[model samples]
Target: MRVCVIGAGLSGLAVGHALKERGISFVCLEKAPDVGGIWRQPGAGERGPGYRTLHLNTAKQLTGYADFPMPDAYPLYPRHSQVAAYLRSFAEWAGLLDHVELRTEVVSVRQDADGPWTVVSRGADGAQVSRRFEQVVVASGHHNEPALPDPLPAGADSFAGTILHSLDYRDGGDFAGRRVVVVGLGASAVDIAADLSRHAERTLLSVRRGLHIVPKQLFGMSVDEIAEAPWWNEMSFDERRRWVEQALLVARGRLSDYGLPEPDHPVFSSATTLSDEILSRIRHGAVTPKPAIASFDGDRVVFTDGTSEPADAVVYCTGFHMTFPFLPAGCPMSADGSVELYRRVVPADRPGLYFVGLVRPVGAITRLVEAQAEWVARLVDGAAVLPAADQMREEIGTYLTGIVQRYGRTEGASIQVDVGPYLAEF
Candidate 1:
């Protein structure tokens, strides 16, 4: 293979189609038993960030690839199974399955000093293989390492209940009649708390920091659709923030009113949680709200507010740490701990290396991934040219300066891209 695409999920599949379309020989490797990435339930010993009751947070129309729309019969927000099936059909439709290898985990990817990429991978059968390719594209999702709260609440080890990250959560039924305290107000946390509230005897939402909770739909339109709308794009960044803030206030009074703390930062300052259920669950009293965990004593979870709750389980939804273990150590990280990539695709120092779907966007990622695929394919085939390495790094520096202002200096925030501006960059 001329290129080795590590991952067979959405991004990898996109790259496969792009490379194949341009007649670039490549092989996509997936550690999972099949192709759907996190959508598919994890096999034994595989900790994934998906649960049985998970649904698409974005609409199907936009989430599906541009060339291959989701099935007409599928709902606006299809369940995980539908998405899993859809992705498989896309692989088959694009004629990429022949070049995709399942259950083959990429162990390491090292760039040769003289050029080319050498990848070591191990198959499910315990056979290790080494291969070299002219180029390497990492489409593996960034939601890799599970990030627990730094300095875990004291006495966590003494807690009689299970302490797990969102990756370990599979289904609410697994905690039937149990009192589960879900930590954080992230996308996964809100969704997990809502899902567990139904089956569990009690669901306590533990929010350490408040985040803006926006509904999936506002004013009869999906939020992503709104972001893609022409009228919405006409507004400036400040204007958009002000507009969204007003719309949210009208749609749902305030997070503090629902027993959740008010956001310390202004709207758009950080990632917002999009959901249509968490607030309602809190209102209905199906899920209780609490402050940050101070410590854990047996079955009791002590909060910073000096309140304690009897929790049978503590599920930390703190979020994920972006990591690429296969790549050279710290190769993609800048001095300030941000993901250092030119145009969020290529590392400035590493030629013939690229990434896809490593961005964080408020809207659907299909379009961005498609654009990345097209651009990368062109780059690989010499139809496009990247700027000089130093020049690319300079541009990255400028982008990060602005990014840190909008989103705090975090590895995850570095990849944040607005729908309109991001698409235009391509």
Candidate 2:
């Protein structure tokens, strides 16, 4: 059977690799000029959301094709370019180069009763192109658009300061000697704000909730050491849980050594690692946290608590939402705005259609996407069959609902699937 993979990002290429391994015929379409989907720098328009020193939040050892691991000489967290190079090497190694159709954008994908799918695509020059395939995989990531603040007041347009999304954010090179307001507490928010504080007159980070930030590296060891443990893939559920728990126990101290205040919450016993430099900047008064935003007017931005701060500029570091304009509305989405996906791969009732990178903060999304791609490729190649749609939906719904009830929902927080547990379940 033939398959058409959409959006030739890392996930697309990964699925393509798996398909090639099984001797399946498939075509990978990339909307951009080349590969490296999210890793592709300076995307379509302005300077894409790439930084000079951009690196995967996860360590290098855990990245790369399932067959070919990232190079050993690479740093703990490889730079964005290194990731692009790794993908290039993976493509060459897997003999997937000829299968990829670069500069191709798929418009809409519809299924046919007799065959697999009727795909509508267009080239960069705006000419409509058509193709038929047995399966279609949507690898276009959730990071396609920037997450703008909601309830932006009626007069928000009257504001004079610059309004930039993380998509257009390069580096804060021009904000020197100016008061800056950062609007989120996510990983990207901390990284960008900390960089800005080095040159900005002062930086104020607006936060809506508390977080458990761990160091990026511990004892000069990358998190990959834990991810690549020999038995990591062999352990039983409970045993794997204990293994990760033990690893976190030693790594947690790195966060403390960074000279940052520790989280006093009772949940500290099991928290994910964030960079210690982020916490240190917070403590040194270089990155002060503000309350969540309520509304905006003129040069002043107000928070939910009625604390209004005058600002020279507002850098909204709020995260992104996954949307498929290509897919019709009401397709199926979790309450959290993510496309309801099973194993974070295929969508329910949408045969021949799959979603590869729609995930919550859920571990390194890249790693999850890689695994999902492999599974999806296997299914398409007739090596396995996905669970029944109803069963898949019910299981996923039950799991997410229980999580919300037990953990209590943060107003606008992303889902955080435990990587080890998720991979085991997969």
Candidate 3:
């Protein structure tokens, strides 16, 4: 085939749509029984990231595909299940189902010095097949690996209660009437804690570090919509940051005022957590913020502040690690956790290889995904041209250098893409 798209989720489906529009021959493979990625997982009762309480952190208008707006009946921030159904409908509407193979897992992707890429995949029936393709588009996503806190709290082995990562968590009702200690302050951490508070006898949020928490909306405008406004886009980076800082302060004062630690960095310097319920939940005493977990003793979870709470379960919402296990080692990422793609799409050294939805945008990644899909499709059909391998690699270095200065060079930080600038680049 001309191209092999490894994944049938959001990005994968987006790529499929792009390829089909351009009359490009390609096959999309997904390990799951269906499409929709995490958005569809929880509704199917298959646990991995998506939960019942999940809602669009960004507005539906921005999150939905550009050509197909989410239904007018759907709310601004549609529920997770709604998003899943919409994605499935989109796949159907775009006529991509026949080209997409569900229940197929990509085993590996390897290439010779000067040869077509060989892709090995396993079918549900336990049969493995090898195929050669002119190009490979990896849209499988970066949420493959679940990251847990390194060096878990002391005495964790003795904690006589359930301790699980956020991915394994399905619903809060499972811990009904039980005290739950939720860890981290990221998107999942806060949402999971708030969800648990409704069912669990008590929900104690264990925050180790402070991260800015911006409501999904501010001044009646979705944060992402605000980000793309012409006036907002015209502001300089520092000006934008300062504006958000002032707005955040006015919207909700110091994080410390709510018993959560104050962020150590400026807005946009790090990925900010977007939510509208967590703070209110805290105020209502549905969830209580606590210092980091210092140790675990039987049913007691000790906090670093010298306090302790008896917990029946601990949910670590530590975020995911970006991984492409099926791909050749060190092809698109570096030892420093930064992606090594020239345009965060093509790895210079590995021509005919591209990645979609690998970026971390401040909000509404839908537009960015569409742009990436178009670019990759153009490159595949010879309509677009890329720089030489040497120049591509040099561009990657410069991008990483700037990333280090702004976001500190971590894996999550490296993939940051400002939606306006990124869209303009295309």
Candidate 4:
């Protein structure tokens, strides 16, 4: 039996590696010319989520593959270029380089009632190819499309200066000497604001809602390491929440002290932003924090707090929308806009389709995806089993109900899973 893997990113690579070890026949398709997914974009001078200043938020020891550790020379948090190079090296070392079809984009994947799945793709030469496989694994990530705020601030079109999403942002040098307003309090928002502080004449961070901004290291240990420690894993949910909340209190005081809003929810209820430089930049007066933008008026941004600032450019680091254009309409998502998956990996009703690296965990995703890949490989090899369709759907319903109670009905809430509990469950 043959399997088809889409994408050559870290997720796709893990799937390929797992399939190969099981002696399974598979073909990996990569739209980009090389491996490493988003990590390769900045170094390759391509535009995407990655920027020149991007680095691993999780430590390299946990971020790298389990069987193949990152090189000794790599820092605890390696740079994007280093990660890209390492991924390429991993592809070569695993003998997956030869199995990957680079520059070949999968346009569509459709399966008949009781036949093999048909995949249609396009090559760099404008050629189309169609093939059939017994099973399909979609490693295509969620960050493909940038999600701009609907109903942007009034008079946005009248803004005289540049307005762009974080996807188009490559370097702070691009905004040298310009007054820039960065929107959102997510990972990209803090990183870009910190990077721009060095080049932009004035860098302002506009926060809409409060989010927990965590440092890379806490209490003399890397956060990822802390997440993996036995002590941390042994704590109950409330205990874990209190532990982190108290730690955040000690590490950086309150978010309000830095002119940012306090998080509406409790710690660990929502996704946290991991950064070591943003708070430092704020403390050093390199970057200023402001309230959310109420409106835009000709090169000026009006904040909700009755304040206004002149902005030469507005960078919306709002985040991304989860999309799967190549898959069937109802595959990844249900009509109610919730993901219908049995464990964030297998579809509720789709029998032979699976996904790896689709989950959003608090810590390193590499190890989690590796675990998922192995599970899928086992299932494909007939050495593992999946529950009945009804049982899978019931599990999905139960998961969504719990998720909605914890995290509100937001787009990101659909895939949020804690690393410790999730990895153990997987």
Off by over 4 Å in 2: 42-50, 153-155, 222-273, 283-285, 293-310, 332-339, 360-362, 365-367, 405-416
What TM-score, computed on C-alpha atoms, does each candidate reach? 0.96, 0.81, 0.96, 0.96
User: Any runs in candidate 4 off by more than 4 Å, and if so which?
Assistant: none
lDDT of each: 0.88, 0.69, 0.88, 0.89
Local distance difference test, candidate 2: 0.69
User: How do the residues 103-172 of candidate 2 rate in per-residue lDDT, one tens digit apiece?
Assistant: 7777877777875887878788888887788888877776666778776544567776777767767666
Off by over 4 Å in 1: 42-46
Q: In candidate 4, how many clashes are counted?
A: 0
Candidate 3 lDDT, 1-426, residue by residue in tens: 988999998899999999999999999999999999989988878869878888888888889999989999999888889999999999999999999999999999998677589999999997999989999999988887789988988899999999999888888889999999999999999899989989999999998779999987788999888876898877998998989889988998778899998877778765688888889999999999999998997889999899989999999899898788898688477776678887788888777899998898878788898999999999999999999999988888888989888666456777877677779998
User: What TM value does model 2 have?
Assistant: 0.81
By the TM-score metric, which is better: model 3 or model 4? 3
For candidate 1, the lDDT comes to 0.88
Clashes of 3: 0
C-alpha root-mean-square deviation, candidate 1: 1.6
Stretch of 10 with least lDDT, candidate 2: 259-268
Q: Is candidate 1 or candidate 3 better by lDDT?
A: 3
